[PDB]
Design a protein around this ligand. Structure first.
Ligand SMILES: C[C@@H](NC(=O)CCCC[C@H](NC(=O)C[NH3+])C(=O)[O-])C(=O)O
Length: 345
């Protein structure tokens, strides 16, 4: 790989601040040599500086943790990716032909209930932030809508898919998703900054606060740090750090978290766009210099995450900006992957 470009990373973070991120940071684990940069504030009201050890909400990076648990259950003979969801969760979906593989790759057609919840950014956040939902509650909210396409037919990202994922984990194991994440992933990899505390609203330890950008241009930011994330759960509620997401995606890609067979299934790409694929709870992004990287993005209120590793896991990068609903910042933070994997122009 090219050398990571720290001057480029510095410029990405500085641009993100200029576009409304209170703080932005990145950590690269380059085959045992660390790069770490941060700019701005973890708490914009107290002025406390952001750092690469601050914990944060990783949003949809949680889908990869859910997918790893499910794929270990496939290795254990407890789950068949081509069986119907309703085989394990009887009566759950209106179509008994929607399969586990289709849910995990967003080809199921299930409508994403979060498009109803967040049609208005700040009112929607205020509506869900202190709610506790069951898994079934969120499925029922999706099922009020029809499906959007035939099973397996079309990629359509939907949080509903990884609500089904959490239901499958709990039904087939008899344990909570927190217990399964802890025993299968967090403890074996010693991810000491990684937690699943739903429905608790506190982020353990020193953390970046999240700042939700309102829909009104120029409007005051909303502190969105403390919320249940119950509207996402196994689709979005993990808390972690840049070092722990680097360790997780490096372990995944280097073959430490499941059989080779199941990692290959995880990397069967469905097209997302001309430079992106989606596997089983896993994203592929194709970078300008002809390198592809593997991992997941996250976007929970107040936090944008990118966590991606090279194909063999030897270089991993995690970047965080503590705002959301700010597409300038989201697009800018993606450039950390270019600087960290493609290096200087
Ligand atoms: C899938 C992933 N997150 C979401 O689905 C966030 C959707 C609302 C984000 C919100 N945007 C809006 O409210 C748009 N009106 C924002 O940018 O914070 C997860 O569950 O981890």
């Amino acid at each position: 790989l090219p050398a990571p470009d720290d001057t480029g990373l510095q410029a990405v973070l500085h641009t993100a601040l200029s576009q409304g991120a209170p703080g932005a940071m990145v950590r690269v684990d380059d085959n045992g040599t660390i790069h770490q940069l941060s700019e701005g504030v973890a708490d914009r009201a107290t002025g406390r500086a952001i750092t690469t050890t601050d914990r944060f909400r990783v949003g949809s990076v949680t889908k990869s943790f859910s997918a790893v648990v499910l794929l270990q259950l496939v290795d254990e003979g407890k789950l068949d990716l081509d069986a119907s969801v309703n085989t394990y969760l009887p009566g759950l979906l209106p179509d008994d032909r929607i399969t586990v593989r289709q849910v995990m790759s967003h080809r199921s057609g299930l409508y994403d209930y979060t498009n109803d919840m967040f049609a208005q950014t700040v009112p929607g956040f205020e509506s869900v932030r202190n709610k506790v939902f069951s898994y079934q509650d969120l499925i029922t909210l999706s099922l009020k809508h029809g499906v959007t396409n035939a099973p397996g037919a079309a990629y359509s990202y939907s949080n509903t898919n990884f609500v089904v994922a959490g239901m499958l984990i709990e039904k087939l194991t008899g344990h909570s998703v927190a217990t399964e994440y802890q025993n299968r992933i967090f403890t074996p990899l010693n991810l000491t900054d990684t937690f699943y505390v739903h429905p608790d609203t506190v982020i353990p330890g020193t953390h970046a606060n999240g700042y939700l950008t309102p829909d009104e241009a120029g409007g005051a930011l909303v502190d969105s740090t403390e919320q249940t994330v119950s509207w996402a759960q196994s689709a979005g509620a993990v808390i972690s750090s840049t070092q722990d997401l680097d360790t997780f995606f490096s372990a995944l890609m280097s073959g430490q978290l499941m059989s080779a067979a199941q990692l290959a299934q995880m990397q069967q790409w469905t097209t997302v766009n001309s430079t992106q694929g989606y596997g089983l709870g896993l994203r592929r992004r194709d970078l300008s210099c002809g390198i592809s990287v593997y991992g997941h993005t996250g976007t929970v209120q107040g936090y944008y995450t990118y966590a991606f590793a090279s194909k063999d896991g030897k270089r991993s990068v995690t970047a965080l900006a503590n705002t959301s609903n700010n597409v300038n910042v989201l697009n800018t933070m993606a450039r950390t992957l270019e600087s960290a994997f493609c290096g200087k122009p």
